Amino acid sequence: NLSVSVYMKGNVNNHEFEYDGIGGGDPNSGQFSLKTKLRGGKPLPFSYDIITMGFFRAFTKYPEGIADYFKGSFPEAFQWNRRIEFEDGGVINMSSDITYKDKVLHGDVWALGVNFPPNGPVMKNEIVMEEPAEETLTAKNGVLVGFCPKAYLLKDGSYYYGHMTTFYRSKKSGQPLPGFHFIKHRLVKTKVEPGFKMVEQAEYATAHVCDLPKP
Amino acid sequence: DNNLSVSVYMKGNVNNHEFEYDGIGGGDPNSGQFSLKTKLRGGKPLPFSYDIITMGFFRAFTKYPEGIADYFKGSFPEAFQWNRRIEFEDGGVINMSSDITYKDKVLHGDVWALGVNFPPNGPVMKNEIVMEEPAEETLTAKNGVLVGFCPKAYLLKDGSYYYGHMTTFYRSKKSGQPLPGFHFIKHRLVKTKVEPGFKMVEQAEYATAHVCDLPKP
Amino acid sequence: DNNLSVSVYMKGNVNNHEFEYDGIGGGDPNSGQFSLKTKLRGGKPLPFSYDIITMGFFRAFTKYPEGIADYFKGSFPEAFQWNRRIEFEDGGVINMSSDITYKDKVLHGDVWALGVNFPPNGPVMKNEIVMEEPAEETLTAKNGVLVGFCPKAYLLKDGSYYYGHMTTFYRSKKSGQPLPGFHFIKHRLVKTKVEPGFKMVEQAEYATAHVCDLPKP
Amino acid sequence: LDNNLSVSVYMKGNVNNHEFEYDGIGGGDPNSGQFSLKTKLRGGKPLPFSYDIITMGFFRAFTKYPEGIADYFKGSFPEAFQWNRRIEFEDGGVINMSSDITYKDKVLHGDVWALGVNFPPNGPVMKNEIVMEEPAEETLTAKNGVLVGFCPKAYLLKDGSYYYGHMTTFYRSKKSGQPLPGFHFIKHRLVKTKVEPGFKMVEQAEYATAHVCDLPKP
């Protein structure tokens, strides 16, 4: 078991907010859950679904055949920096500095969302959930880069999409980068209080290579 | 049938380099495995990486499990088109479109490729791509068409990677055909034989549709 | 010369709709003003907004002041190519490329247009654009070509705007021609006549190169 | 709307996981569209990336507007505006910035966030290879009650080559009911007039003038 805490300070379309989160799970299982709580006295004035991934690739089931960059980074752990570029021009950048101290994995997270159409599903809180996703990961320019199409189910039954790019960088000196692989993800908000003042979310994630035969 | 013949014609223009390919092959559309041999028209070598047009050379060839509706096989006898962009890390973009028809006993693809803004010293124009990695395509209905998103990772001759984001619109020519539910297609495309200058290429693609096999809370 | 005739042929495919235009016109390349008339081949209307292909239909027609190197006129008699993308706000992307030649007294563009991923309910496929606004193109030499970046604003019937980002690579076919310094081109393109279905269009472009007139340098 | 407006600015930023904070002081003439700022990096460590990508973080109130173009920014006063912004660079780096601008006493204050991500570690930003940004033309158009500006950015590198980005900014007045302006452009020239090692201190000036198209019509 690995205890997790997280703090996010964010600004999305000039709306400032902060969350604290607590949770954890078995990092080897690739399954963990967090409860986040909004600081302050304002409901969150946009879709929380665009910040769910701000709230630890240490929680990924890695099979023996794939180098686990994230667990390999410990005790120094990693950072990441990330953008999700959405179909309507909105972009959220997020960054996290993850530390493992006092037997807790902590994420110190920034989120900065810009250029969301005021009438778009993000600012109008029209996202129901994000679909499961496949992240494609490759070493490049000395960091690990993941690309992940994101599909968000909207209240009207349609989809809103984004492309996520993440740079993951170990803080362990000279840690080898892993080989090309994928991570399959399912993130679900299992509990949501009005205005996203409290959210419980779970992420399941498993690393894998291609199942398909050769040629 | 478990046996489907394929023909393809591609005309293309990448950074103002015009080219044409003819392709012939086939495979098992139900198994999601097929191969094609392509032949470059004219006497000259391809002046850019063929790897960026491999996907121009048939989603009919996808293993679909019974849990997921097969839009592509469902489109037949009218078949489909698709239109597509790959946006590369260095600003190069290749657009491709195909009109797929089924006639006599052959699935034909009539393909356009138009690649622009590739850095002249970039891996595409300098022909520095070795191969493309397997890929996961995420597919969803969007504004009445099926849209696939697929990160593309290209291994370079220097051992590094070059990436692109692919977006494809798939549209059945069978009017009113329902779109499938959200799903994924896993792909592995390999150039199994390459003649110098990409004057001839043999390529195979394996593709299987799947949903998420992760448990749910 | 103060009068230069133009001929253009465009073959295009936008969301799998194929079309061809022929255009003729001309103007004063030194004044940066010219107009052409395009005519759609065949009897069917254009199934999308012609406004996204207007720029397919000659940077030779740019007023260049003495202190800015004129890459386009400088390329003559060999002339230039260009390759171009417009990435629109809703994910539609049109690529275009042109090979420009000069065979005496006429300056001739052979153009490809390939537009993909336009939402079927978007302003392009629904023909909702009424005009494009004037534009500023920022140009810099990059990796041996001239690169222009130009925000595009399209006015819609409903009074709102539809946006795109245009990137163009311009490459002289005159061997060893130096690239110009950083500069801008201001543009105004207007469709002065439009027949139903865009079967015929008259369009004019005014273009003038400039540097920054603000103080400091 | 007087010919001298003092400005203060605070920016907190995080670019490729490098955190920093700047305080800035200056001002200028909002009507001539010219002002300058002195920024000071908090702490003793140098800025680990090119300051040039955050220059625009450090007030569209300072724009020369001719009579025929509505001045959304000065029109927002005393409530002022916000803005939120991205610059998408050629190599995939993206910096988002946002500012809340307030007018209290004389001073115009900007409270700025900067969050830069996905900059290639050996790219010109992280390797501090940018010399300057070129002058720019910003195309502005109202959409959805927001003024959107698009601005190609060209950064000159130490080797004489260019590094480019596309800037998109949303500007939103905090004056309720304020009309949006018509389509127009703003020409900009931003110069770092002074730079101390590690970008510990920078003086920068911006000149900006709104204009429409002066080309003939058919």
Side-chain angles (χ1 to χ4, degrees):
Chain A
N1 191 281
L2 176 59
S3 289
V4 182
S5 56
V6 61
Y7 166 77
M8 181 190 288
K9 57 172 168 290
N11 182 323
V12 170
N13 273 29
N14 303 286
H15 293 99
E16 289 185 327
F17 66 92
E18 297 164 82
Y19 277 92
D20 299 289
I22 299 170
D26 182 355
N28 303 305
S29 74
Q31 301 184 350
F32 79 124
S33 62
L34 291 178
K35 181 183 201 276
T36 63
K37 179 197 146 296
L38 186 57
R39 324 231 294 209
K42 287 194 103 308
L44 190 82
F46 66 88
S47 178
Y48 177 97
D49 294 78
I50 71 163
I51 60 171
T52 51
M53 299 185 283
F55 299 113
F56 295 87
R57 275 282 60 72
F59 294 85
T60 310
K61 192 169 93 79
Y62 267 85
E64 264 191 290
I66 309 169
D68 188 340
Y69 188 60
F70 308 106
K71 290 186 195 64
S73 71
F74 278 68
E76 290 96 343
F78 60 106
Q79 330 163 305
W80 59 256
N81 56 77
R82 171 178 283 162
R83 73 191 198 266
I84 314 163
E85 298 191 344
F86 296 94
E87 73 180 49
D88 60 353
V91 177
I92 191 165
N93 288 0
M94 290 185 295
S95 296
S96 180
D97 185 46
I98 292 162
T99 51
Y100 180 63
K101 187 156 264 189
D102 321 290
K103 310 299 268 67
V104 54
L105 196 63
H106 189 259
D108 181 41
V109 186
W110 289 54
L112 186 59
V114 303
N115 308 157
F116 286 97
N119 50 355
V122 172
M123 294 319 290
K124 296 275 102 156
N125 184 38
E126 288 163 357
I127 303 170
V128 167
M129 54 86 77
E130 36 227 296
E131 290 290 355
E134 286 280 359
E135 179 175 18
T136 301
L137 298 101
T138 317
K140 80 126 39 187
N141 299 140
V143 298
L144 179 64
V145 185
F147 311 98
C148 186
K150 294 296 299 178
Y152 299 88
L153 180 67
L154 305 187
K155 280 177 164 70
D156 67 357
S158 68
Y159 283 95
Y160 176 65
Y161 67 82
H163 297 252
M164 177 171 71
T165 303
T166 310
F167 279 26
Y168 307 92
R169 181 188 271 263
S170 170
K171 287 178 286 175
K172 168 134 54 166
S173 177
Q175 184 183 346
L177 288 160
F180 178 84
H181 66 284
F182 301 87
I183 293 169
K184 207 216 147 7
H185 300 268
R186 185 198 300 284
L187 191 153
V188 175
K189 301 185 259 72
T190 57
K191 282 197 198 286
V192 172
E193 292 190 357
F196 300 110
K197 59 181 173 175
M198 184 281 275
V199 175
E200 293 185 4
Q201 52 175 95
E203 192 210 348
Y204 302 162
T206 297
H208 65 97
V209 289
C210 187
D211 200 299
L212 296 167
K214 282 154 193 178
Chain B
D1 303 38
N2 296 139
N3 334 293
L4 182 54
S5 187
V6 177
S7 61
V8 60
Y9 167 77
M10 179 187 294
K11 59 171 170 286
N13 183 324
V14 171
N15 272 32
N16 302 286
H17 294 91
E18 289 183 328
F19 67 94
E20 292 171 289
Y21 275 97
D22 298 289
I24 296 289
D28 185 340
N30 300 313
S31 74
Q33 305 189 156
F34 76 127
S35 57
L36 291 178
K37 184 192 205 170
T38 61
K39 185 185 183 178
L40 180 60
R41 293 197 186 181
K44 297 179 276 57
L46 200 72
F48 65 88
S49 176
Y50 178 97
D51 296 79
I52 68 162
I53 60 166
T54 48
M55 301 183 284
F57 301 112
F58 291 91
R59 276 281 61 72
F61 296 88
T62 312
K63 181 177 175 181
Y64 266 85
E66 285 188 342
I68 317 164
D70 186 338
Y71 188 61
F72 310 105
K73 293 194 188 66
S75 73
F76 278 71
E78 290 89 359
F80 58 108
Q81 328 157 309
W82 59 257
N83 56 80
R84 169 179 283 165
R85 75 194 195 265
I86 311 159
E87 296 196 4
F88 295 93
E89 67 174 65
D90 59 354
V93 177
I94 188 167
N95 287 358
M96 288 181 280
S97 297
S98 183
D99 184 43
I100 290 160
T101 52
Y102 185 54
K103 200 232 276 83
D104 296 320
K105 207 145 66 71
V106 50
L107 196 62
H108 185 253
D110 187 39
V111 189
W112 289 55
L114 226 209
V116 304
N117 303 161
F118 287 95
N121 56 349
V124 169
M125 295 319 298
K126 292 301 188 177
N127 209 324
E128 292 175 336
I129 300 165
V130 177
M131 52 108 263
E132 67 208 280
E133 293 289 1
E136 287 280 358
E137 183 176 14
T138 300
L139 298 95
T140 175
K142 223 281 197 283
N143 307 128
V145 296
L146 183 64
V147 184
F149 307 101
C150 182
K152 290 299 296 173
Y154 299 88
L155 177 65
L156 302 187
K157 291 174 184 185
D158 69 5
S160 65
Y161 284 84
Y162 176 68
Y163 64 84
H165 295 254
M166 174 173 68
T167 303
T168 312
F169 277 27
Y170 307 93
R171 189 195 151 270
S172 172
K173 284 180 284 177
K174 178 135 60 179
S175 284
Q177 185 185 166
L179 296 161
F182 178 86
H183 67 282
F184 301 88
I185 297 172
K186 51 181 187 194
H187 299 268
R188 185 198 299 283
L189 191 154
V190 173
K191 306 184 312 299
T192 53
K193 117 173 283 77
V194 179
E195 297 273 73
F198 303 111
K199 291 173 168 172
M200 264 165 282
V201 181
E202 291 186 3
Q203 51 174 98
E205 191 217 353
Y206 301 165
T208 298
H210 63 94
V211 291
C212 186
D213 69 2
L214 254 25
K216 296 163 83 173
Chain C
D1 193 57
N2 278 178
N3 188 254
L4 177 60
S5 285
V6 178
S7 186
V8 59
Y9 165 82
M10 178 188 289
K11 58 170 171 290
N13 182 324
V14 172
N15 273 29
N16 302 285
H17 293 281
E18 285 178 340
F19 61 95
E20 292 166 287
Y21 276 96
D22 302 281
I24 48 173
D28 185 347
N30 301 305
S31 76
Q33 304 184 163
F34 79 125
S35 57
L36 45 88
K37 178 196 287 178
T38 63
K39 178 172 171 74
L40 179 62
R41 295 191 184 188
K44 85 150 178 154
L46 198 70
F48 61 91
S49 178
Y50 177 98
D51 297 76
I52 71 165
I53 62 172
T54 51
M55 299 184 288
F57 301 109
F58 290 91
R59 277 281 60 75
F61 295 84
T62 313
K63 182 176 279 133
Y64 268 85
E66 197 164 350
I68 312 176
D70 186 342
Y71 189 59
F72 308 105
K73 292 184 190 70
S75 71
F76 277 68
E78 292 98 339
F80 59 105
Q81 321 159 314
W82 58 257
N83 53 259
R84 173 177 281 164
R85 70 190 202 267
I86 313 165
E87 291 191 1
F88 298 92
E89 63 177 57
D90 61 353
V93 175
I94 193 168
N95 288 1
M96 290 186 283
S97 294
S98 183
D99 185 52
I100 293 159
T101 48
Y102 181 69
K103 45 196 279 288
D104 302 7
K105 287 80 205 64
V106 186
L107 229 222
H108 175 257
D110 184 58
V111 188
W112 290 59
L114 188 53
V116 302
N117 307 159
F118 285 97
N121 58 344
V124 172
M125 296 316 297
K126 287 297 162 94
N127 185 219
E128 296 293 341
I129 300 165
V130 294
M131 60 96 80
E132 62 205 281
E133 294 289 4
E136 285 284 352
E137 181 176 13
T138 303
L139 301 101
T140 73
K142 183 103 167 107
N143 305 135
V145 297
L146 183 60
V147 185
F149 305 101
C150 182
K152 296 295 298 167
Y154 298 88
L155 180 62
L156 306 188
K157 283 179 167 72
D158 70 10
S160 339
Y161 283 92
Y162 177 64
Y163 307 123
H165 288 83
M166 174 170 68
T167 303
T168 309
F169 281 23
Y170 308 93
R171 181 188 154 270
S172 173
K173 289 180 285 180
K174 178 183 286 300
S175 186
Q177 188 189 168
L179 290 157
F182 177 85
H183 65 283
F184 304 85
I185 296 167
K186 48 176 65 178
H187 300 270
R188 182 199 303 283
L189 192 152
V190 178
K191 308 189 306 296
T192 56
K193 193 165 172 280
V194 177
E195 292 323 295
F198 300 107
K199 288 180 174 188
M200 271 264 232
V201 177
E202 292 181 329
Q203 56 177 89
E205 194 216 353
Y206 300 82
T208 296
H210 63 96
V211 292
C212 183
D213 68 357
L214 298 167
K216 212 68 256 184
Chain D
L1 190 70
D2 94 89
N3 291 340
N4 185 50
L5 182 61
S6 65
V7 295
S8 61
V9 61
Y10 167 79
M11 178 191 289
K12 56 172 173 288
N14 183 322
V15 170
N16 273 29
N17 302 285
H18 295 278
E19 299 189 303
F20 63 94
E21 313 212 315
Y22 277 96
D23 302 284
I25 293 290
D29 189 337
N31 298 305
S32 75
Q34 304 189 155
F35 75 128
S36 63
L37 290 176
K38 273 190 46 59
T39 63
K40 322 99 177 67
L41 181 61
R42 323 234 281 216
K45 60 200 288 169
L47 199 73
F49 66 90
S50 178
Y51 181 94
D52 296 79
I53 69 162
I54 60 169
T55 49
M56 296 183 285
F58 302 110
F59 293 90
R60 276 281 61 75
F62 296 86
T63 312
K64 184 142 181 271
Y65 268 84
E67 164 66 53
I69 310 172
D71 187 340
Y72 189 58
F73 310 106
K74 289 188 196 66
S76 72
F77 273 72
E79 293 89 1
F81 54 108
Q82 328 157 312
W83 60 256
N84 57 78
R85 174 177 279 164
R86 70 193 202 266
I87 314 165
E88 296 186 357
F89 296 94
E90 62 177 60
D91 59 355
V94 175
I95 192 161
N96 286 359
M97 287 183 287
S98 298
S99 181
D100 186 42
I101 291 162
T102 53
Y103 177 75
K104 193 155 61 193
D105 112 287
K106 195 234 289 284
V107 307
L108 191 64
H109 182 73
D111 183 40
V112 190
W113 288 58
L115 191 54
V117 302
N118 299 168
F119 286 97
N122 291 67
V125 169
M126 298 316 296
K127 291 288 180 165
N128 188 33
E129 292 168 351
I130 301 165
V131 168
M132 55 175 53
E133 61 206 282
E134 292 294 357
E137 288 279 357
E138 181 176 14
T139 303
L140 299 102
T141 153
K143 193 162 171 190
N144 314 136
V146 170
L147 183 59
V148 182
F150 310 99
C151 187
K153 292 299 293 170
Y155 301 88
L156 186 69
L157 303 191
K158 283 173 179 289
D159 65 4
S161 68
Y162 283 97
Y163 176 67
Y164 62 82
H166 290 81
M167 175 167 330
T168 301
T169 310
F170 278 23
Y171 307 92
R172 183 197 139 269
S173 169
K174 293 176 281 178
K175 168 94 97 304
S176 165
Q178 194 197 160
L180 279 157
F183 178 84
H184 65 282
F185 303 84
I186 295 172
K187 54 192 166 183
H188 300 269
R189 182 198 299 284
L190 195 153
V191 178
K192 301 186 303 163
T193 58
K194 282 200 278 280
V195 52
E196 276 189 31
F199 301 112
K200 175 75 180 69
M201 181 280 276
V202 180
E203 194 195 26
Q204 48 175 99
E206 195 216 356
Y207 298 168
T209 296
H211 63 99
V212 289
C213 182
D214 72 4
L215 293 167
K217 298 165 85 81

